[PDB]
């Protein structure tokens, strides 16, 4: 219900869109460093998956 009427104001003089954005951005600032970690280890593990697939193909070609 605050999504539809989020452009109204509080008693102090703050918009509901403003405080919702502030809470969401505070959550994003809390969670952003650990996301950039888990994506860097995610792409790292993808890179070792590639290197494991290619060591498998080269050993398959060397042993026949």
């Amino acid at each position: 219900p605050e999504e539809e009427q989020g452009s109204s104001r509080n008693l102090d003089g703050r918009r509901l869109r403003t405080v919702t954005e502030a809470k969401a951005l505070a959550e994003y600032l809390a969670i952003k460093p650990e996301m950039e970690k888990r994506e860097k280890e995610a792409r790292r593990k993808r890179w070792q998956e590639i290197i494991e697939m290619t060591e498998r193909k080269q050993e398959e070609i060397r042993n026949g």
């Binding site: 969401a24 951005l25 959550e27």
Partner: peptide
């Protein structure tokens, strides 16, 4: 080309024309 355009107009088909993710925190 004039003859071909006239042929295209003559055989124009009336039967082929009909009228009438991510989260909110990141954005």
């Amino acid at each position: 080309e004039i003859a071909r355009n006239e042929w295209q107009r003559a055989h124009f088909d009336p039967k082929k024309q009909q009228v009438g993710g991510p989260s909110a925190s990141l954005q």
